[PDB]
Amino acid sequence: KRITTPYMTKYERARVLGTRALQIAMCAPVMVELEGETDPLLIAMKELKARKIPIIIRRYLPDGSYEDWGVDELIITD
Amino acid sequence: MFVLVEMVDTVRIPPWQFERKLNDSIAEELNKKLANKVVYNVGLCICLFDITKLEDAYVFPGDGASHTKVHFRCVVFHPFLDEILIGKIKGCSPEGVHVSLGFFDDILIPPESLQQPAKFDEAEQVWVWEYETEEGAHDLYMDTGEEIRFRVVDESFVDTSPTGPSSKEAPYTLVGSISEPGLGLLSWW
Amino acid sequence: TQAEIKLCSLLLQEHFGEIVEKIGVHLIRTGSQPLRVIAHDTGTSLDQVKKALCVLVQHNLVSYQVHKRGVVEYEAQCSRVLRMLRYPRYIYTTKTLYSDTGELIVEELLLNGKLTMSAVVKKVADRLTETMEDGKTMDYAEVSNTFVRLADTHFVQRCPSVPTTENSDPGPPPPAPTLVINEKDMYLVPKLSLIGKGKRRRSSPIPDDGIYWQANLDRFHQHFRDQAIVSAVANRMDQTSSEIVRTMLRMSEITTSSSAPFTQPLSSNEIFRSLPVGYNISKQVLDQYLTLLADDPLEFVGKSGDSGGGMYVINLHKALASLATATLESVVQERFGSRCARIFRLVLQKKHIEQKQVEDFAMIPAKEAKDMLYKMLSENFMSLQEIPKTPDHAPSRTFYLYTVNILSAARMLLHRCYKSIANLIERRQFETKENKRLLEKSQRVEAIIASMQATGAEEAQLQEIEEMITAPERQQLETLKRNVNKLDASEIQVDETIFLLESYIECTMKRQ
Amino acid sequence: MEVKDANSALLSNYEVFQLLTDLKEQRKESGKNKHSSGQQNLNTITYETLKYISKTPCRHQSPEIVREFLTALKSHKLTKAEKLQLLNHRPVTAVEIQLMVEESEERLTEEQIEALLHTVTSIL
Amino acid sequence: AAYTFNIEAVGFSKGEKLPDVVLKPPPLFPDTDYKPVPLKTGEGEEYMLALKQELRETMKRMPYFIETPEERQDIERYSKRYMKVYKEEWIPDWRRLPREMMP
Amino acid sequence: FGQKDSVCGVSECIIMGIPMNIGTGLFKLLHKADRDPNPPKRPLIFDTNEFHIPLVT
């Protein structure tokens, strides 16, 4: 089982959108059907709202044990 | 004369290659990086053999490319000591008989390991050997390079790097012997 | 003592191996450590630590004590590791003063470290069989008769003995048996009635158990100091005076400490009686010799007495000071030339001097005197003094007095000698490593010539090794062999400088 | 990069032949891009290594040939590296098995050497 | 050019004969005028030279020499078993050694 | 003394130019590539253990 918080924190949201917008700024395949949006940060936020970002967050507890969370299974919020 | 060498490595997979299965891309990127190069203490890597364990694909900060740590095995031209090979002759020299081995070029035969009844040239390039009854002193190591059979007795690693302030010798030299009975050209035995 | 640690690393790696020299170097370098931290600070397995510590404590290379809470803290002796180098001189001096049996006894002692009397006489009787032939076997009794002659002369002594646990705290065993050295039974040999014969290696319950023997290296150092002072007198005065000095040291052998500022006084009436009978001498000429050696300003002897007629002592610390001063001036003479050794002896005798005084006294011009002065300052032979006028200590307003201090220069010369032997051992091992392929090929061909040499050795195979390609590189094998022989000979002969320096640095210390 | 094992297993040249043959089967469907000189190096070393091996006597061999070859050769008191060279070079006379086997005149009797030649020529 | 320190405080009151500007660094091994004194030979000094070589060849075969094991060897050879020599193992006196020495 | 200073603290992470542990550096990201860990191995034909009983006794 996994004991940490099920909400995506604001730091996890910031870095997932950062790494995903950086990959979309290079020539990565976009998972959602974009509609003429050019700025890759907007494309990353549209991927985040539709839950398709291929990132696994590995949260390190300070003793050394870790937990793998998919981005599609966190509870994102405003 | 080929061995497996278990190596680990970090392979930077660029992000335009995410549409393709990771095992094919790891193999392609490792063949683009290890082929035809001499690793300092194991020898000359020919090509990848297989990938045996493939750990998790981190994304480092500041780059979108996914790095992953790969356990693999690779075939390597590393002939062990006292081993018999066959290869062509490139040319002769005052230092000895430069032997090509197909892909690999620097196999040198010293004069001290040539066949003993003749060890010297008449200020001519091509090295000679003398037998009394037939072909006295006119036998020769032709530069067209018919296949000879030799025996590696020494290998040497130099760490060929730009020595001195910045920002052509061979890193894998291999010295053999030919003086045993039965060796030499294949036309002689 | 970084030079000492490097030399001890080389000597342990040569005479014991790798995973024992790691433990020896760590014990020399850090000091008193318990057993678990020898394991942890080195990184090896614990069983290798146990085997390494036992093979070190066998040869008396590490000591051990008991402390609070029951821990055993080991400690290596750097001096005892350094004295592993003088083993051929020990084996040569026991062959000099005794037979080949007394040679092989001290050989088995220095090789095994600690043996019992029965084991060492068995091994000597076994190893003398190859030296003899035609049915004659060596027996134990004549070996034991030499062993007790060594034990009487104190070259061989007994190890520190275990305590009797039935008398000493009966109950649970302590972690370490707490060995104690008994002054009484050092040289009391155990009697043996068991006699026998040595096997000729055909390939086809102990009364003195626990009594172990070790070579007493301090007696060998005393004998070497005796030979040093004897050769010094033999080179200065005469052979007869040297034999008188040898007789005085022989009478001073068993009666004084190895470290004493002045030995026992000797009456000349027993100096006369103790001389070997080959000399035609009288009492009066002996009195002349003793009073003319007392006239020497080198002062190897002193009067120190008036009763009983001729009362005479021999000097120890002044003699070792003379020998160390001769070594320290010999190295300057051979390194810089005679005209600089003149300046060194001048700054030695006049205890303090200046530049103009050197140029006047030495008959050596300017730009060649000061050159040699400053070369000897750059090599720590010769100290400055700088008597100051003001407390500003400025160079413009003072006087510089040259000074030779023998102690600091002798310590410096010892530090150079250690690194010198370390460099020679480095060069020998480098040549053997770079030629080990030809060495093993020569080992193969001598194994070929060695097998069936006695039976059925045809002369054709003697040519077939010469027909083999080892014959172009037999030149290289001869070059390698003469290089290794010269490096081993120099490694031996630097120890003569090392001992003469180490005796002086040892005797100028008090240990209070 | 880091090497866990410099010498992990010895290879017959047939395994390397089969490896480069299977590498040729899926290559050259999309040519080089002139973005790095890595594809040039891979093409040259794969081509020239296969061209060298294709004149050795390790062509026309199979897995089960090597299986029965090591099976028949198992009972002769030889090392790994000698059986490797005997598999690679296909000796046909007796002068070269004197080379490929160390102390040939002391371990192997002349009849055993002839049986070894027969064992080699009978399978390959 | 002029210096921070005054040359006159160093010397050179004439102001001439300055030390020359070195072009090439001095060689690694300067030539020395003198040589070592040749060695001492004799019928006693030569016996130590042979005994010292006997000490190495003996103590490498004694059981006190803890062998280092062979590591990552490439091929096994029939010439390898000529090299390998089995040797009997000495036993420590456990009464003189402490208790923690026991395996 | 030779006292070794860590670069785990925030200010020296800012000095040495490495990303710090607070904030958006406390975790690590992973890419969810279509991967297959422990893939099947190519068989060794020559060097197996069953064909190579050792020579020495």
Swiss-Prot record, chain A:
GO CC terms for this protein? cytosol; fibrillar center; nucleoplasm; nucleus; RNA polymerase I complex; RNA polymerase II, core complex; RNA polymerase III complex
Cellular localization per UniProt:
Nucleus; Nucleus, Nucleolus
Q: Which GO terms describe its molecular function?
A: DNA binding; DNA-directed RNA polymerase activity
**Keyword set includes Phosphoprotein:** yes
> Biological process GO annotation list?
transcription by RNA polymerase I; transcription by RNA polymerase II; tRNA transcription by RNA polymerase III
Principal place where this protein is found? Answer: nucleus
**What keywords were assigned to this record?**
Acetylation, DNA-directed RNA polymerase, Nucleus, Phosphoprotein, Transcription
Q: How does it assemble?
A: Component of the RNA polymerase I (Pol I), RNA polymerase II (Pol II) and RNA polymerase III (Pol III) complexes consisting of at least 13, 12 and 17 subunits, respectively. Pol I complex consists of a ten-subunit catalytic core composed of POLR1A/RPA1, POLR1B/RPA2, POLR1C/RPAC1, POLR1D/RPAC2, POLR1H/RPA12, POLR2E/RPABC1, POLR2F/RPABC2, POLR2H/RPABC3, POLR2K/RPABC4 and POLR2L/RPABC5; a mobile stalk subunit POLR1F/RPA43 protruding from the core and additional subunits homologous to general transcription factors POLR1E/RPA49 and POLR1G/RPA34.
Q: Which family does it belong to?
A: Belongs to the archaeal Rpo6/eukaryotic RPB6 RNA polymerase subunit family.
Q: What is this protein called?
A: DNA-directed RNA polymerases I, II, and III subunit RPABC2
> Which residues of the full-length protein are shown here?
50 to 127 of 127
Curated annotation (Swiss-Prot), chain B:
Cite a single Pfam family from the UniProt record. SHS2_Rpb7-N
- Where the protein is mainly located, per its record? nucleus
Q: Which CDD domains match?
A: RNAP_III_Rpc25_N
Q: Which SUPFAM superfamilies match?
A: N-terminal, heterodimerisation domain of RBP7 (RpoE), Nucleic acid-binding proteins
An annotated Gene Ontology molecular function = DNA-directed RNA polymerase activity
Any Gene Ontology CC annotation: nucleoplasm
What is its subcellular localisation? Answer: Nucleus
The family note in this entry says: Belongs to the eukaryotic RPB7/RPC8 RNA polymerase subunit family.
Write out the function statement from the record. DNA-dependent RNA polymerase catalyzes the transcription of DNA into RNA using the four ribonucleoside triphosphates as substrates. Specific peripheric component of RNA polymerase III (Pol III) which synthesizes small non-coding RNAs including 5S rRNA, snRNAs, tRNAs and miRNAs from at least 500 distinct genomic loci. With CRCP/RPC9 forms a mobile stalk that protrudes from Pol III core and functions primarily in transcription initiation. Pol III plays a key role in sensing and limiting infection by intracellular bacteria and DNA viruses.
- What is this protein's name? DNA-directed RNA polymerase III subunit RPC8
Q: Which organism is it from?
A: Homo sapiens (Human)
Swiss-Prot record, chain C:
Q: Which Gene3D superfamilies match?
A: 6.10.140.1450, Winged helix-like DNA-binding domain superfamily/Winged helix DNA-binding domain
Which consequence is recorded for altering residue 290 to K? Answer: Loss of interaction with POLR3G and POLR3GL. No effect on interaction with POLR3F
**Record-linked Pfam families:** HTH_9, POLR3C_WHD, RNA_pol_Rpc82, RPC3_helical
Which BP terms in the Gene Ontology apply to this protein?
A: defense response to virus; DNA-templated transcription; innate immune response; positive regulation of innate immune response; positive regulation of interferon-beta production; regulation of transcription by RNA polymerase III
Q: Which UniProt keywords apply?
A: Antiviral defense, DNA-binding, DNA-directed RNA polymerase, Immunity, Innate immunity, Nucleus, Phosphoprotein, Transcription
Positions of region (Disordered): 160-180
Q: Which molecular function GO terms apply here?
A: DNA-directed RNA polymerase activity; single-stranded DNA binding
State whether keyword Nucleus applies.
Answer: yes
Q: What is the effect of changing residue 335 to E?
A: Strongly decreased ssDNA-binding. No effect on interaction with POLR3F, POLR3G, nor with POLR3GL
Could you tell me which residues carry Phosphoserine?
193
Q: Looking at the UniProt record for this protein, which Gene Ontology cellular component terms does it annotate, in alphabetical order? A: cytosol; nucleoplasm; RNA polymerase III complex
Q: Where would you find the membrane-spanning parts of this chain?
A: none
Q: Where in the cell is it found?
A: Nucleus
Family (UniProt): Belongs to the eukaryotic RPC3/POLR3C RNA polymerase subunit family.
PANTHER family in UniProt: DNA-DIRECTED RNA POLYMERASE III SUBUNIT RPC3, RNA POLYMERASE III DNA DIRECTED -RELATED
Give any extra note attached to this record.
Answer: Antibodies against POLR3C have been found in the sera of patients with systemic sclerosis (SSc).
Q: What is this protein called?
A: DNA-directed RNA polymerase III subunit RPC3
From Swiss-Prot, chain F:
Q: What tissue specificity is annotated for this entry?
A: Expressed in the brain, in the cortex and the white matter (at protein level).
Q: What is the effect of changing residue 2 to R?
A: In WDRTS; uncertain significance
What positions belong to coiled-coil segments?
Answer: none
Please state where this protein is localized. Answer: Nucleus; Cytoplasm, Cytosol
Q: Which disease? A: Leukodystrophy, hypomyelinating, 7, with or without oligodontia and/or hypogonadotropic hypogonadism: An autosomal recessive neurodegenerative disorder characterized by childhood onset of progressive motor decline manifest as spasticity, ataxia, tremor, and cerebellar signs, as well as mild cognitive regression. Other features may include hypodontia or oligodontia and hypogonadotropic hypogonadism. There is considerable inter- and intrafamilial variability.
Physiological role: Catalytic core component of RNA polymerase III (Pol III), a DNA-dependent RNA polymerase which synthesizes small non-coding RNAs using the four ribonucleoside triphosphates as substrates. Synthesizes 5S rRNA, snRNAs, tRNAs and miRNAs from at least 500 distinct genomic loci. Pol III-mediated transcription cycle proceeds through transcription initiation, transcription elongation and transcription termination stages. During transcription initiation, Pol III is recruited to DNA promoters type I, II or III with the help of general transcription factors and other specific initiation factors.
Q: Which family does it belong to?
A: Belongs to the RNA polymerase beta' chain family.
Tell me the gene name: POLR3A
